Design an enzyme around this catalytic site. Sequence first.
Site, PDB file in Angstrom:
ATOM      1  N   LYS A  25       0.727  -1.298   0.175  1.00 23.76           N
ATOM      2  CA  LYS A  25       0.112   0.078  -0.055  1.00 23.76           C
ATOM      3  C   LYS A  25       0.820   1.485   0.055  1.00 23.76           C
ATOM      4  O   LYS A  25       1.012   2.049   1.006  1.00 23.76           O
ATOM      5  CB  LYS A  25      -0.938   0.146   1.166  1.00 23.76           C
ATOM      6  CG  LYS A  25      -2.487  -0.785   0.876  1.00 23.76           C
ATOM      7  CD  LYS A  25      -3.207  -0.128  -0.041  1.00 23.76           C
ATOM      8  CE  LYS A  25      -4.407  -1.059  -0.726  1.00 23.76           C
ATOM      9  NZ  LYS A  25      -5.626  -1.708   0.055  1.00 23.76           N
ATOM     10  N   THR A  34      15.181  -0.688 -20.300  1.00 30.41           N
ATOM     11  CA  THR A  34      15.487  -0.232 -19.140  1.00 30.41           C
ATOM     12  C   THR A  34      15.516  -1.006 -17.817  1.00 30.41           C
ATOM     13  O   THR A  34      16.366  -0.786 -17.050  1.00 30.41           O
ATOM     14  CB  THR A  34      14.481   0.740 -18.690  1.00 30.41           C
ATOM     15  OG1 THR A  34      13.294   0.290 -18.675  1.00 30.41           O
ATOM     16  CG2 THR A  34      14.243   1.807 -19.769  1.00 30.41           C
ATOM     17  N   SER A  77       0.526   4.336   3.026  1.00 33.04           N
ATOM     18  CA  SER A  77      -0.886   4.330   3.097  1.00 33.04           C
ATOM     19  C   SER A  77      -1.272   5.378   4.461  1.00 33.04           C
ATOM     20  O   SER A  77      -2.080   6.166   4.417  1.00 33.04           O
ATOM     21  CB  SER A  77      -1.757   3.239   3.089  1.00 33.04           C
ATOM     22  OG  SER A  77      -1.815   2.600   1.657  1.00 33.04           O
ATOM     23  N   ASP A  98     -27.122  12.224 -11.433  1.00 39.56           N
ATOM     24  CA  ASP A  98     -28.211  13.175 -11.479  1.00 39.56           C
ATOM     25  C   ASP A  98     -27.104  14.379 -12.024  1.00 39.56           C
ATOM     26  O   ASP A  98     -26.301  14.416 -11.737  1.00 39.56           O
ATOM     27  CB  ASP A  98     -28.867  13.543 -10.163  1.00 39.56           C
ATOM     28  CG  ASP A  98     -29.834  14.856 -10.274  1.00 39.56           C
ATOM     29  OD1 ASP A  98     -30.866  14.710 -10.992  1.00 39.56           O
ATOM     30  OD2 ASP A  98     -29.723  15.464  -9.259  1.00 39.56           O
ATOM     31  N   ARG A 128     -26.855  17.655  -5.413  1.00 33.98           N
ATOM     32  CA  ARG A 128     -27.762  17.195  -6.140  1.00 33.98           C
ATOM     33  C   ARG A 128     -28.502  18.451  -6.849  1.00 33.98           C
ATOM     34  O   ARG A 128     -28.881  19.440  -6.049  1.00 33.98           O
ATOM     35  CB  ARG A 128     -28.446  16.086  -5.671  1.00 33.98           C
ATOM     36  CG  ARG A 128     -27.808  14.863  -5.434  1.00 33.98           C
ATOM     37  CD  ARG A 128     -28.732  13.758  -4.956  1.00 33.98           C
ATOM     38  NE  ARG A 128     -29.890  13.758  -5.365  1.00 33.98           N
ATOM     39  CZ  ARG A 128     -30.587  12.458  -5.801  1.00 33.98           C
ATOM     40  NH1 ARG A 128     -30.020  11.389  -5.225  1.00 33.98           N
ATOM     41  NH2 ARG A 128     -31.888  12.465  -6.407  1.00 33.98           N
ATOM     42  N   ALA A 166     -32.350  18.925  -8.278  1.00 36.26           N
ATOM     43  CA  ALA A 166     -33.687  19.003  -7.640  1.00 36.26           C
ATOM     44  C   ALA A 166     -33.455  19.820  -6.271  1.00 36.26           C
ATOM     45  O   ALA A 166     -34.101  20.791  -6.274  1.00 36.26           O
ATOM     46  CB  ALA A 166     -34.088  17.806  -7.655  1.00 36.26           C
TER      47      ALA A 166
HETATM   48 SM   LIG Z   1     -32.701  13.993  -8.573  1.00 29.83          SM
END
Ligand SMILES: [Sm+3]
EC number: 3.4.21.-
Length: 689
Positions: A73, A117, A259, A395, A463, A465
């Site tokens: 990691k 290489t 990590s 969305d 989002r 809406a």
């Molecule tokens: Sm939506």
Amino acid sequence: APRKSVRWCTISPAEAAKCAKFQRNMKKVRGPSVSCIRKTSSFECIQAIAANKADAVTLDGGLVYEAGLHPYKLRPVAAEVYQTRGKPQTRYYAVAVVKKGSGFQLNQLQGVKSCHTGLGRSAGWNIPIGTLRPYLNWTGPPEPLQKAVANFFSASCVPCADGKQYPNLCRLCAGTEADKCACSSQEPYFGYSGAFKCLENGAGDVAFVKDSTVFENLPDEAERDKYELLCPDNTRKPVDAFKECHLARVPSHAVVARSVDGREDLIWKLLHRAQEEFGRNKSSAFQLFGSTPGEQDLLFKDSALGFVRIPSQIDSGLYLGANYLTATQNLRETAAEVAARRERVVWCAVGPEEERKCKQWSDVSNRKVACASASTTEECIALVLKGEADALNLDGGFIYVAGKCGLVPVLAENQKSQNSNAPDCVHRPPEGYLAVAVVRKSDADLTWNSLSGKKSCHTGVGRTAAWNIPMGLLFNQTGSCKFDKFFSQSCAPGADPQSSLCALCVGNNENENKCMPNSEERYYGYTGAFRCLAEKAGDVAFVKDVTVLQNTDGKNSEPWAKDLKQEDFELLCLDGTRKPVAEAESCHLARAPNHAVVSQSDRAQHLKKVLFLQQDQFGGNGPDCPGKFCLFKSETKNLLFNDNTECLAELQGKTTYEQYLGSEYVTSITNLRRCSSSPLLEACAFLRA
Ligand SMILES: [Sm+3]
Ligand SMILES: [Sm+3]
């Protein structure tokens, strides 16, 4: 108060000396201190750091990857920057150098002596061998790729090669007794330069290297006209046309660490000052990007402008980027495996209920689609970015970011709109949807002008809406960015959980996962939001007209809903007007883009074709919808797509994000960012640069 010294992992006597001179030059400078541990190879250096025996080692793309594989990691902390001939970069072209008059074309390499290489690095191996894979005749994964290439080229000079078993892969290596084929600057032919010489001295006929190599030792144009570039199409051109001529482009070499507890914070300070105390011509007492005539590329890549600090969410895979991870992994998956992966489609679910769903669709399609999920829309966007995932529904709000990350909208969700629901959907131009302001008629003193400090239920932040439109609006009236300050309290998952905005949310049934941004949050999305106001947890619901419609008058048979009624709900309208839920057409904040599936442009097509299939066997008229599965159906839970999805359509040419969402919104949105910024939008910011 003190903070330790950066342990730098060298790879050959050469490196140390250099590292040495650096450590001392450093202190002589009164800058953060350094130190050199000593091993024998990059691969080794990896492990060392892995076991906190050290902390850093500049690595090649190819090696970064390995460095990221499970057990260790490792993370690209910093990136070098180079030539480009003009505007500086973190990407470099991988080529093939051959001497004019050698003849053979790239598709003809069988029989030629070739230079490399080292084992596993990009320019010399990863890119090349994968290109020529189609002429290897090598069973795949079960049979060692070493023996392949081994037997593909007459003999060669492969650094790190296992020449005992495949001596041919180090035959060409001019190196003393055990220095032979060694995987460091102890092997003369190791590294870009390394390889070039291996070709220059007539040892080989083709070197796989860096685009600047040639110019990196042929100072004189004349000399430079003695050699060429094997272009993937089968022609040969001049060394300075790498631009057209190249096997591939590959991301820069990078300084890697842990990590966890990498001490990123010490490394980047070290390098930053280093650019600044001994980089491009700053002093003469030392030079970072300068190495001996003996061996080049010591510690960093010679003549590298300097570094850039990678943002943290970036974990290797991503750093690399799709194009490279596929091929890299491609050299260790069977053809079968391979072609397999190319012909299918992996969908990215957000949330359990969904994975379930994706699981269904899977078994229903006979595996033509499979699944990849995680806990956040961001998340599934990254996965596509990495290539574990091909695609998912977004969305407009996520369209914007996806788009920022270089993805394109393929097909559109087209509601059983109203005119003539014939196979029009497919061609029907997506006509949109209205975000409305919803509350209890009951509660009428209320207006749009009254929302200061009240209760608000948001389907999700980031989002349309919900979030995007309103806040954007509110942003237009408050002159202030303290989103959490507007409504007294709020429900908007994916917000900071220890904020008011995640105040009114209820976690899953057993009240766990408060505010996550997925379906477990019983207050998530369209439905979840409508109810948050339904169960009156709040006063204002930002949702779509249609929303209300779908759960009142006995529509959603869920308790909380059940006895809900249209008449019980009113729409706040931009002129302080309120209306019944139907007058939306004249009582809405605006018009939102329909949602849009998306993926890497690459698969744009194939994505389209099988979904189209899937949608002919399981959507609106699915010969098998009410039967053995409905793609577009999910218990008022909106699994994968909106429950009212007639089908998915052609974007009517809108093919670039901006096109699909359109300038304004786009602008609307880029304005809000002046308020806030997300992790991934930032990430990409650096990757796509
Ligand atoms: Sm939506
Ligand atoms: Sm390289």
